[PDB]
Design an enzyme around this catalytic site. Structure first.
Site, short mmCIF file in Angstrom:
data_model
loop_
_atom_site.label_atom_id
_atom_site.label_comp_id
_atom_site.label_asym_id
_atom_site.label_seq_id
_atom_site.Cartn_x
_atom_site.Cartn_y
_atom_site.Cartn_z
N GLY A 194 19.94 -53.50 5.23
CA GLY A 194 18.95 -52.41 5.20
C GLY A 194 18.16 -52.53 3.91
O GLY A 194 18.80 -52.57 2.84
N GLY B 235 15.77 -50.39 2.88
CA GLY B 235 15.06 -49.12 2.75
C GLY B 235 15.37 -48.45 1.42
O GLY B 235 15.73 -49.21 0.52
N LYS C 205 30.68 -32.40 3.23
CA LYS C 205 29.24 -32.53 3.40
C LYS C 205 28.76 -32.35 4.82
O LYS C 205 27.83 -31.58 5.04
CB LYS C 205 28.75 -33.87 2.83
CG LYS C 205 29.01 -33.87 1.30
CD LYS C 205 27.94 -34.81 0.73
CE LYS C 205 28.30 -36.28 0.94
NZ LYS C 205 27.04 -37.00 1.36
N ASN D 76 14.56 -24.63 3.77
CA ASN D 76 15.93 -24.09 3.80
C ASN D 76 16.12 -22.62 3.57
O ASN D 76 17.01 -21.95 4.14
CB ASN D 76 16.76 -24.87 2.74
CG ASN D 76 16.87 -26.33 3.04
OD1 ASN D 76 16.45 -26.88 4.09
ND2 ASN D 76 17.48 -27.15 2.19
#
EC number: 1.1.1.169
Length: 291
Positions: A7, A9, A176, A194
């Site tokens: 990856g 990114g 989490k 939020n």
């Protein structure tokens, strides 16, 4: 050592950069093969780092000492299975991502498998990656057979402080994921910052009661109320932010919902726990993704 980072990114470039500054031999790996990964990352003090690294070299993969994976959760298991016959069967694979459920998709992997998540924050703006904040990467063994690989947390500490090994890493992963099962889909469905969630206490409790019921059966000590109080504290502290899931929605990128409330549904299902609020939200977000 020799590391292939899967990856290129934001999170992958942050690791490539850190490994690269410690003098390790590194390559990236792209879903769309190219001979190089162009890294361009801004450090927390504003300094730039910009190098061109080797990418998608099968011989470098076949002699790598660590496969570090930094893809989004729904991409992981297919991409890892694609490279596992080429990577050495002795070489450890570390998965770093949000959400849970990739280990179940990778149970026949022969290599040592480690699971992990980070609180480092890295944003991609076009071809620019910004290291927004430093943090901690928690890693640990995916299965019973991966427990002897705690040495990787010492090496990685030297590359991108701080790193911690946990013998029972699922405890930190659920902490989490519990919060993300409330914040991500609600913000996604109400397309709000939020802070809006603060105006919906009763409903948040219902989701937290479902989350709490699955986690307790999974072997961890938590309370619906405790979980509710913490989520509200997170919502207050991040009031103006746009969640990671809403961010995906607004950009019409696929979401990680199959590995956040989708995982809770799957585990709820295995334990036989009622999760009507989580199922409604999960199905709603899935309908939005399709459009």
């Amino acid at each position: 050592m020799k590391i292939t980072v899967l990856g290129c990114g934001a999170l992958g470039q942050l690791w490539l950069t850190a490994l690269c500054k410690q003098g390790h031999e590194v390559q990236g790996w792209l879903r769309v093969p190219q001979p190089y990964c162009s890294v361009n990352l801004v450090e927390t003090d504003g300094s730039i780092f910009n190098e061109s690294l080797t990418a998608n070299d099968p011989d470098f993969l076949a002699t790598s000492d660590l496969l570090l994976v930094t893809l989004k959760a729904w991409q992981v298991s297919d991409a890892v299975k694609s490279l596992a016959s080429t990577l050495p069967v002795t070489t450890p694979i570390l998965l770093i991502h949000n959400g849970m459920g990739t280990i179940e998709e990778l149970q026949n992997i022969q290599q040592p498998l480690l699971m992990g998540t980070t609180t480092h924050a890295a944003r991609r703006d076009g071809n620019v990656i910004i290291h927004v904040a430093n943090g901690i990467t928690h890693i640990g063994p995916a299965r019973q057979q991966d427990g002897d690989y705690s040495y990787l947390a010492d090496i990685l500490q030297t590359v991108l402080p701080d790193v911690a090994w946990h013998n029972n890493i699922r405890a930190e992963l659920w902490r989490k994921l519990a919060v993300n099962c409330v914040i991500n889909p609600l913000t996604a469905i109400w397309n709000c910052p939020n802070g809006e969630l603060r105006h919906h206490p009763q409903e948040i409790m219902q989701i937290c009661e479902e989350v709490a019921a699955v986690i307790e059966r999974e072997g961890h000590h938590t309370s619906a109320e405790d979980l509710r109080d913490y989520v509200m504290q997170v919502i207050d502290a991040t009031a103006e932010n746009i969640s990671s899931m809403l961010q995906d929605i607004r950009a019409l990128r696929h979401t990680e919902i199959d590995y956040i409330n989708g995982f809770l549904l799957r585990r709820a299902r295995a334990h036989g726990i009622a999760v009507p609020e989580n199922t409604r939200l999960f199905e709603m977000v899935k309908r939005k993704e399709s459009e």
